[model samples]
Target: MAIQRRIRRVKTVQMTTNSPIHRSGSVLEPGNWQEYDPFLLLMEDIFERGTFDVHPHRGIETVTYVISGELEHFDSKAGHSTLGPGDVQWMTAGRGVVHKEDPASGSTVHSLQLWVNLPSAYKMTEPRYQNLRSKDMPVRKEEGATIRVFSGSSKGVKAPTKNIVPVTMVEMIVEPGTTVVQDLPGHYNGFLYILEGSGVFGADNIEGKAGQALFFSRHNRGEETELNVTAREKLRLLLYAGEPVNEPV
Candidate 1:
């Protein structure tokens, strides 16, 4: 298992495409995939017009979390979905599938697409989908902000996404000029990525503006220092944790 700091890191360029939309914090590009293995991709991309045409994927599960706007998606296996802010769409490309994302109406579509690779055993299973509405997701209040649990236990609430895969993720929104504490489980590998605003990770004063990511090591022994977050304005971040897969595939 690799700690977030031990894993390599780089910034991604939000290039224009046929759809031509701006994206930030592209952490799941090709060169960075294996570093976050088990979870291959964690990207925030947008679609203004046209659509990302049919694509094929296999041996992994894909999660799409909508931050703003709406997205219209269709699959070759006779499935379709429409997503809105705070909504989550989880798909299992167990064997293979072709899918596309089209902009809804004249609305600009903004969303996140995270890919989690399946272990050797689960690679060939059937394809599936689980779309959860914003209202349906489990929320846990933590200090100055609220957290939407996509996986793992937080404040006694568990995410629906936890039922399929044993991964941990959460969306955190901190109020302006407020401080908060998020204690990571000692057993799980954890890290926090600043989507908006500045913060710190661990004892060091990590200045995180939008598009920056902070990672932490495992093995918390009570004496381990806490991460400080001094938000200049409202802060929006995503924290991810999981039991590090010990077996190499």
Candidate 2:
């Protein structure tokens, strides 16, 4: 008999569509499909141009990563910045915060907005922001692939941004016929969102494509977990993992 890999394959693939937030394209909201622990929501917003008026948030951290175009944002805490392709903004809405975001006038915009749950102990810890530039993000190129570390480490390159909660986030773009292996903490629940192409994952050979997401099951502690990814074509994948916040929703 063959030994089963501890790192499981994709449980389901979520197809997203337009949101009422007044955007031009669709949004992939994972919360609607299932309860992804420690993560409340993940929105991939693609718009020609739009506005997200000043809004408030509490008990969560909002991580915004711009994949294309630009986004201009400002908040009540006097935080303001512009994010271009590859830039990231990690905002902690601990106690509370009111912020607004809009496309830089006349420019198209495409970005991912992820809502990370905060544990009860630090739900009201006070608001703050980490605005990271695209140029500042660390990147490592292996044969046939390139990985950009946004809030994590890959191939020895660590992202500069720090998280209130432990998390790993990186974007991997692979050329045709490439494979990459990564080791991660066993305690963290992991997932991958395909941004561009189809790929095979794990020993199960589960395949996922653009606009779809793959969820990984929990693995045993005291040992490190590993993920094996193979590109079927030119592929762009956003990978994220974080420790579980075992609390009530």
Best by TM-score: 2
> Best-fitting candidate, measured by lDDT?
2
TM value for model 2:
0.87
Report the error of model 2 at residue 145, Å.
1.2
How far is 27's C-alpha from truth in model 1 (Å)? 1.7
Looking at model 1, residue 139 earns an lDDT score of 85
Candidate 2 local lDDT, 84-106, one digit each (tens): 88788889999999887788877
Measured with C-alpha atoms, the lDDT of residue 59 in candidate 2 is 91
Which segments of candidate 1 are over 4 A away from where they belong?
A: 1-25, 162-164, 220-230, 246-249
Local distance difference test, candidate 1: 0.66
Instruction: Tell me the whole-model lDDT of each prediction, alpha carbons only.
Output: 0.66, 0.76
